[PDB]
């Protein structure tokens, strides 16, 4: 909150998690997500205001938003690959490879549709890191200091669009459009969470203790 809009953006861009590679389709996706979670934890600690929160609140936020963060990251990575989802540079999945897992292709379709939406809106990297930080902070509120940070990212988003050359009317319109996407990202997460728990109960794939706990919170 003592950061400028440009400092806010630069700090978020600098805190970006690395793109990992993949090492049984569910096995590959589970293994990838598990290794990504560790890098997500360190990422969250670099999100302005997150370490200021009580540790109990930090747990709760990550438990609620971890799949949303993985999904929006995936959607961001797949923007330059239409009709495909880039889980990893060595794991570029076309739509039809979602048919490999039961009830997976409709999750892919929503992820692909989200990527095309970011593409049509010409989403910027600066806007992306803001949206991802918003997800982390907002997705567990309805379960003071958090809302003032959220208002800071809102100011930051507006500053970006104003700096990008958008008129005042285009700013709050685009701001609305970006935040309305988070509702769909929320939807995908809940469906993905139900699917992941479905795979766990059918013994489709072994889950790490970290992932088990992530599912338990839902």
């Amino acid at each position: 909150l003592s950061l400028t809009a440009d400092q806010m953006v630069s700090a978020l861009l600098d805190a970006e998690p690395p793109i990992l590679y993949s090492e049984s389709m569910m096995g590959l996706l589970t293994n990838l997500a598990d290794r990504e979670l560790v890098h997500m934890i360190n990422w969250a600690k670099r999100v302005p205001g997150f370490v200021d929160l009580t540790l109990h609140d930090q747990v709760h936020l990550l438990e609620c938003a971890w799949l949303e963060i993985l999904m929006i990251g995936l959607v961001w990575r797949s923007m330059e690959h239409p009709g495909k989802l880039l889980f990893a540079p060595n794991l570029l999945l076309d739509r039809n490879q979602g048919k490999c897992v039961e009830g997976m292709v409709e999750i892919f379709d929503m992820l692909l549709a989200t990527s095309s939406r970011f593409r049509m809106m010409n989403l910027q990297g600066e806007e992306f890191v803001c949206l991802k930080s918003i997800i982390l902070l907002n997705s567990g509120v309805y379960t003071d200091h958090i809302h003032r940070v959220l208002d800071k990212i809102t100011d930051t988003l507006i500053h970006l669009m104003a700096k990008a050359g958008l008129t005042l009317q285009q700013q709050h319109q685009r701001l609305a459009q970006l935040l309305l996407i988070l509702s769909h990202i929320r939807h995908m997460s809940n469906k993905g969470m139900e699917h992941l728990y479905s795979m766990k109960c059918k013994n489709v794939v072994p889950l790490s203790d970290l992932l088990l706990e992530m599912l338990d919170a839902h």
Partner: peptide
């Protein structure tokens, strides 16, 4: 407790 420990 699990996550509770990587934020140490």
């Amino acid at each position: 407790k699990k996550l509770h420990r990587x934020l140490q």
